[model samples]
Target: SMSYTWTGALITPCAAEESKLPINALSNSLLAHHNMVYATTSRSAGLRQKKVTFDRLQVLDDHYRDVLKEMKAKASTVKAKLLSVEEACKLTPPHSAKSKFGYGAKDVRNLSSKAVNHIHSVWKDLLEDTVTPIDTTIMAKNEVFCVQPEKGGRKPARLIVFPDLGVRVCEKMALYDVVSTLPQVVMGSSYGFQYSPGQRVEFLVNTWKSKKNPMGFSYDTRCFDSTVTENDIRVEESIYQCCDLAPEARQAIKSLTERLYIGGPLTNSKGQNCGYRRCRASGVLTTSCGNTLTCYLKASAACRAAKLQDCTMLVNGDDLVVICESAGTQEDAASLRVFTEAMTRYSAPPGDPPQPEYDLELITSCSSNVSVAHDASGKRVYYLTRDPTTPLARAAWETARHTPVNSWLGNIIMYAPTLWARMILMTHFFSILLAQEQLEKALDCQIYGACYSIEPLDLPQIIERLHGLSAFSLHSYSPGEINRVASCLRKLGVPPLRVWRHRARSVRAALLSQGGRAATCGKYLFNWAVK
Candidate 1:
């Protein structure tokens, strides 16, 4: 999500709930849950304020009904009589005719022609309709952030949504304005002027140095390129979507001059009537680093070791850090010891592991792992942490002093920040939730109305998890790489389509990027199957 939403519902992406019927009443309860969650997460910044709040409400089960309804509705929406399922079967024949629709007229099953029409209609509605982000608290760009338009003179410079691209493009524009003869501050940073030589300047511009620039005070990452690290990860297609550049686009002053305020990359433009669609260009092969990081984060510590089939990969050094949080349990300390031993069985054990010690709680695992380097002093040395006084803290303290450890070091990295970072991580997690809420609501209205069985979807990751478990015990490899990874698993095979369908529907409702239009990407590997 490019923006933030409220911290209302303490919802997780997966997990089934109670059996219920005539789902609409359950829908009302779900809506109330969303409202209550918003109220719960609304007032605080840290765990005492948010995480505890979310942890409390996550116990409720409302999505099972939603999933049941979604599976039934989505699959059977188009009647065979309503459209010719027979004809569809003739064209794309069901993957297994006998298995799905039984032993009649085996030639018919793609989606009925009417199903096609129904899906098309749903896609169009989703594409055209705009969503309102209820918990949004947007920060606007004042005079300082305004910059001159880039190439093609008077035409609006395409707003590239990729955070990196946006930063690069903005930097280029900023540099051009600074070095050239143009009124860099007044024109480049203002709303009334264009970069073209012919346009008349009517308003003052906001320079990069201006407090009005949408950089400080807001958590929005769209404004500039900061750091490109392993953690700076976003789904590939999301990097390409265009967003309106208003603090609040829906309430913005819409003028022909205001057209330059649009964000996202330019997809098309003529001599004068230029336009930018919320579309992305194709071709995004998953980066090796991206795939590894994704798979690692999605796996448990035990699950990770078994899944690596020694596929050579370009590793991101920063990706090696892990963050652990213990609820002050012996199990937690043992978990820490397991990680510590894996890193280096040096100088006996640190006794017992305790979490990072900080009341404000803002520690990170980034400092845990280190590499040796020569300084001006000419001696090679590795990075280490400052000492903490308590035995548990001291144990954590001693563990921090080590050479650049191997992949197993990630366990220690997580072991160190088990305490302090947990609070920050939890707070950070909820902050992310707010942003997700905004994204879902901005693109799809499904989340806007009173909530109904809100479930965060993560089927692709689930399949990956199942794959890891199956590797050692179940089978050779998942039977179908592209079409049926989920189905190949004993756990997910029966409900693959239903789960995926629910994910698509819930995502639509949440991101409001529901149905076909929101589901398909301009550049997507799974777009065909997902659609």
Candidate 2:
């Protein structure tokens, strides 16, 4: 039956079970989900999930049309240049899964002649066929439970897939521009990543209060991409058609949509055909672009239907936050129900009952919570944060590999002023770097898979961009937070924070002696580590 089959290897390269004690040095932090303890499933969960997967009517008005036009205009600026077969092969990561065709990732990277021909054939097939859906290798993505009150279990392994390297390049040509620039143009700061944590908070609060006694709430769509029906895919295609794409680019985009974008077959570990998926797969080339645009379109229409006043939204994939005017407490609650009803009418069902909050700070988006604490100078500081488990796990990994980037470096840059990040993450990583003599080495870390070179001295500017002067003032972590961090360190086999403090003095002195950027880096970032 289509309902039950051996989906494939249930194993993921990185799972909570693998991150237990005796952490591997060569463990890929990208795949690792640290501090996630257990998982459970519910039957009724899928019942509502299936209901929301059905197709729905969409209302595209003048505003939708205008946004679409602007997105197309921005996409037109990106030139489309197809990559050679060998060049495409080289882009495949060294650790990627081996193909069923017998050649491995190494063969692809080494430009094995056989692999090149296979890759070339894949590319030619993409160019020739406009509706043959590309097959995708599905893997379960282990996401740590955050919203749950217990907060220590893994969610069901999310099914995600990626296309072959040859098709990936064509995806880059046809939809890369659409994904990268379209959301920013259409949603502005509400595009989610456009603003830093502080800016996002500010935007939410400002938008919420634009009308007196305003109400706000965040929306969580269950299996958002998986609910994207063929009609929805076609609507996205309609949006893409507005663009002035090259003749070949136009054909490639259409083909990618009908074949790859619409949906594909899921192949499991044993190489058995698990099932066919008609909804959007998380592993596709246009996954990000598709989700962002589709979510915005659906939410925008839902907002109109709910008749919410001065509605402003921030969307990152399926996660969304809406701020709008409130008539009163009772009316506001009713309005939220209306909003939820409107959302369901559009095929996006809420994972949980949507509760509208009068207080903006209570609404969490992107898993960050707003809280208040005093900084080094004993003044109040408001910042965004979530569990430090993932960042800490990556920091432990960075200590040994001398890898350029990981989650820890990002936390240090973004949450530079927060006590958890400034004291724990910065102290931990710098101590490791100092011990290995890699502090001054220019290393690049990934943010959204794009690498950026980092220097400790650049902390001030990055901190300023994220939290302004608040980064310097941040201090006084709650005792409970520190205790949890300590327990996490011991569990992961990383050195204690106190040991990091001792090392920081020597590292700070050593850095100061170097002068210039090294001196500044020590003073601004590591000074907090000093006793």
Candidate 3:
């Protein structure tokens, strides 16, 4: 018989083959499988109960309970738009008198910058570059919004939205953060056979300018708009399928496989002083306090390097910047490691392996630096234009990914709620069927790419329809923030089915009316009729 030791205690091994204990169940199960043995849950039950919980009703109540009742609705109905003509008169400068404090759900439950600040460092640099980007920025003035421009001052063939630097995730609900909870509602018991009947059509949309891009770690729902009541969400079951059931389970597959590329946490190339007055007024700071351009380059270098390393990445050409500075020795690895660990510990991905390449890029100089100790470190790849100390910074930052703060939000978003539930349902019936419907629609649908490439000032129509869907979605979420959310989505070029429906109709009508190039727009016409 063999003996095993655990927690300073010994276990006597069994002798008989039939009596042989499951060594994996006894030893590896806790240490390798669970890993909690390293930190015991020694707290009393009273303390251990801290977590998000929804109390289910009794058995009989569960039989026929209205799911809406489970939501703790507020006493006041938060309206979509707010106006204050009288209050605007008293101020010398005439500012709208909407109280940020009094407007939406209780401040306690609404999403806060502080709550989403765990990934602040990763996202901050890009944000600064967005609003007030660099002047020496590479983007040609004429091609400001797209890859190419048309003559006669016509808008370009492509339109790009520069996302807001400091995006508020959920300002309306103290009950929940939409980023954190939308996935929950879609995945929880609130979703089941009983809820599957709303399956004729679907739409996936984003409510925040900051979050509208598909490159980030989130799902776009399939939505349906009502002609009368106006509902904009249906949780596109197909996207969920393509993302969940595909052997890779990668949502980025669409971009990776095609000419289309989607990214989030986009940065501005214009530098961080052009149009970000709101951030400045609120004392919100840019990635670098001084000399944002230098920081912008460094951050971009790090981000680009990190992207090449990881398959999922966001790339924005905004003017924001992030500078890693040292208050002398305080910036040394030991001290910096503390900050890094703290930041990454709460925000890093679960099972995230360390990232050394990112830090090396951060500290290693490119072709831009010249001084003793200013040369690129021997271990780093040197570009002709940067600093010597960056390689070290890059290395440290790379390892920082494993730290909890840097990747915790990712862990929570991925394994804690959304993706897990999708995987579960996908393992069962009809995930493929639903997914097929979504892919077909996406493939056959009218992307705004055509309009930007073909007809340009058609933006108002795009905005109106996207806003219409956003407005409808607000009825379920927070209607108060819908306008701003719609603004964010529109900037990112997210087209809802509502927009698609209109485009399909318009494109087809033109083909049918002209009969000159009917086949070119025939696909769109078919989509319109089928829908």
Error of 2 at 171 (Å): 1.0
Off by over 4 Å in 2: 1-19, 23-121, 142-152, 198-202, 369-383, 393-405, 441-444, 453-470, 475-518, 529-531
Per residue, candidate 2 scores C-alpha lDDT tens digits across 20-116 of 3223443322223333332223322233234434444434455445555655565445444444556556565555556667677788878897777
The TM-scores, one per candidate, come to 0.17, 0.76, 0.16
- Candidate 3 lDDT over 406-426, as tens digits, reads 121211111111111111111
Name the regions of candidate 1 deviating beyond 4 angstroms: 1-110, 126-235, 238-531
lDDT of 1 by residue, 1-531 (tens): 121122333222112221111123222211111111111111122222121111101111122223223323322322111112223234332222121112222222344444444433332332244232101111111110111133322211112121221111221221221212211221122211122111110010111112221110001111111111212233211111121222221111121001212222221111121222121211111222222222222222221222211111111211222223323444434544443332122111122232322111122222222222233334432222211112122122222222122111222122212211111111222223334453133111111111122222332232224222111111121122212223222221122334433433333343334344323311121221233
Ranking by lDDT: 2, 1, 3
Per-residue error for 62 in candidate 2, Å, reads 13
Clashes of 2: 5
Instruction: Give the TM-score (vs. native) of candidate 3.
Output: 0.16
Q: What is the lDDT of residue 500 in candidate 1?
A: 37
Span of 10 residues, lowest total lDDT, candidate 2: 1-10
